[PDB]
Design a binder for this molecule. Structure first.
Ligand SMILES: Cc1cc2nc3c(=O)[nH]c(=O)nc-3n(C[C@H](O)[C@H](O)[C@H](O)COP(=O)(O)O)c2cc1C
Ligand SMILES: Cc1cc2nc3c(=O)[nH]c(=O)nc-3n(C[C@H](O)[C@H](O)[C@H](O)COP(=O)(O)O)c2cc1C
Ligand SMILES: [Mg+2]
Ligand SMILES: [Mg+2]
Lengths: 350, 350
């Protein structure tokens, strides 16, 4: 058997009658499916436990994910190989805690609502990958560090200091957050994980055998930003939002890194520095994407590679041949320095 | 009136009798102090609400913080100007949920224990400053960005790539985490806040009028690392753990920066880049600490400043005079490059 626990947020106000109606329909359907569980609500938050045969549970959950009456659905626990039902007598027992007045339940409700409102804020400051590990039954704090081969992605905004000096502070933050959103959506879609922001910089990583995905993510980010620039409103700072991207590949250490006050589950190692140093080279080139020969040679698709004969990097060991992709995008460009100059001219006059 | 809500972890196993004994003593004392509230336990976690006159509540809480039977004490909510008591009839009502078998409380306990174990993990991946804001009644997600003058601190480990290549992965992570712990303890003690780790780098900040504290924190970190090196066990990698530190001062933007999957409450702006570029200069100098003339001139104490006549920075606007402190520490050094060479020689032979 399988058992799922999740929390969600009301998408709109729901009356007590509407909540009980959800419970009636849930009980009618779950009884036929040999599914049991409990559904609680407290001040605009749902909490549900569902248990039964795994195939059936998965299909019910996918239907629940399509219900427009809740949103921000977070799976807290996914238990497989469950032996005994927790709620064998309840096809779906509905407990509206807003309406409950029992004297012992009253303090429990206060603590549950305080902890829930804290948790739902902390979620936004937390990586989704952390929640996935917890839901699988593993405490991420006890994962031991390990050496692992990764593709490291590093990107930043071209001439970002100009934004910070020529725009209102609300608009500066809107631009950087738009950029971080674009990068995160595409990296995550390609199976990578964003691990760190610092200033206007993104650091992300992919599995070591996923160079094709790292390259595709990088090209798709550059195309998404081109579309965003061309379609932005008149006078919008997004019209001059440009990126550089560097990719490197190497053995890194993955694990919990930080202090007793705060840590992240992230990566350490030379490929992080190499990716950042390659990304900085894009400021002297017409190409917005550059990557090492190790990334190039690990790819399996027939990419339109171009060798950037020069390899004037610093801090490396045996230098490195550097490559890009030659497409209509990386080609139709007038190069950093010129772009930096235009960014200032444009932003001075918006 | 004031009302405090907090959670804590049992420091050792406590029996049901010991829990009820805490509740008896709490009830006896709180009744005399006109304090009311509730104390819950669930699988090795305490939850407490206390309410009453503010002075009295603060003193009771300080006594509770000294009790050796719990640890990891986190204030979830501090309410001031409370008008009505939540638990007027309970000097301290003790509810041991492990022992409760009520049929409606049974699902509530399961959800409370799932949410609590998630929250206590998320705490370690979260900044303490976030929890402080939440406890004061503010949702940090809704704080608007603002321009603000800050001192920015940036530090990294000298020749860190050597550690990652010559030591077992568990030992590499132990070293970096020791370094991040040392920095965090001292920065926080001096009123600053650590905001970002990336690789082996620390980024922190202080209020704009706290240059003295940023300088003191920097000197105290360098002295703590000297003590750590000299007292490390035979053959320990901590014997060759060295730091560089750069400090800059400028207007930055403070606010929520990130994606829909993940954000931090942090800072953006040119002082971040300047501090990192000053810290990199320490690799060409005997001095481990360097800072801008703006930091120097904002200090109020009679520091033993030394002007590093050269100011060969890059990327700046009108360059910058660069300073350090000349003490027995920054003086008794043989300079980067030489230090980098020694780090490799030592770590190759441990
Ligand atoms: C919080 C919440 C919990 C729900 N739980 C269940 C459930 O346990 N079983 C179920 O079949 N539907 C559940 N639903 C409803 C489904 O989302 C959907 O409305 C229903 O299954 C459609 O059934 P019908 O097509 O017969 O009307 C839930 C909905 C919400 C908002
Ligand atoms: C979880 C926990 C909650 C407590 N709550 C109270 C309280 O509400 N009021 C109080 O006076 N002591 C409380 N205490 C106890 C104090 O920490 C301390 O033991 C007690 O006040 C000492 O009183 P005594 O010196 O008369 O023995 C609590 C202890 C623990 C572990
Ligand atoms: Mg930039
Ligand atoms: Mg370093």
């Amino acid at each position: 058997m399988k058992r799922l626990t999740y929390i969600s947020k009301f998408s709109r106000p729901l009356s007590g009658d509407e909540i009980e109606a959800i419970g009636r329909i849930s009980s009618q359907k779950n009884q036929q499916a040999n599914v049991t569980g409990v559904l609680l609500c407290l001040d605009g938050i749902f909490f549900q436990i569902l248990e039964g045969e795994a195939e059936k549970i998965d299909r019910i959950y996918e239907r629940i994910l399509a219900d427009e009456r809740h949103t921000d659905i977070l799976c807290l626990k996914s238990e497989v190989e469950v032996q005994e039902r927790m709620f064998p007598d309840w096809s779906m027992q509905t407990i509206n805690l807003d309406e409950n007045t029992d004297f012992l339940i009253r303090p429990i409700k206060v603590l549950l609502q305080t902890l829930t409102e804290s948790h739902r804020i902390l979620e936004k400051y937390t990586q989704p990958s952390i929640f996935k590990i917890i839901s699988q039954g593993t405490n991420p704090l006890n994962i031991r560090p390990k050496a692992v081969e990764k593709i490291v992605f590093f990107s930043d905004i071209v001439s970002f200091s100009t934004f910070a000096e020529k725009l209102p502070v609300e608009e500066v933050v809107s631009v950087v957050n738009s950029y971080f959103s674009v990068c995160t959506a595409i990296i995550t879609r390609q199976g990578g994980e964003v691990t760190k922001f610092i200033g206007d910089c993104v650091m992300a990583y992919f599995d070591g055998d996923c160079a094709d995905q790292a390259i595709q993510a990088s090209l798709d980010i550059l195309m998404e930003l081109e579309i965003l620039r061309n379609s932005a409103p008149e006078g919008s700072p997004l019209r001059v939002l440009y990126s550089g991207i560097g990719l490197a590949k190497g053995k890194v250490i993955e694990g919990n890194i930080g202090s007793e006050l705060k840590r992240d589950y992230t990566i350490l190692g030379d490929a992080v520095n190499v990716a950042a140093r390659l990304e900085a080279l894009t400021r002297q080139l017409s190409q917005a994407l550059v990557f090492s020969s190790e990334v190039k040679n690990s790819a399996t698709k027939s990419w339109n590679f171009i060798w950037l004969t020069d390899s004037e990097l610093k801090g490396k060991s045996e230098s490195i041949d550097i490559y890009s992709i030659d497409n209509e995008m990386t080609r139709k460009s007038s190069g950093g320095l010129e772009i930096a100059r235009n960014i200032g001219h444009y932003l001075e006059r918006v």
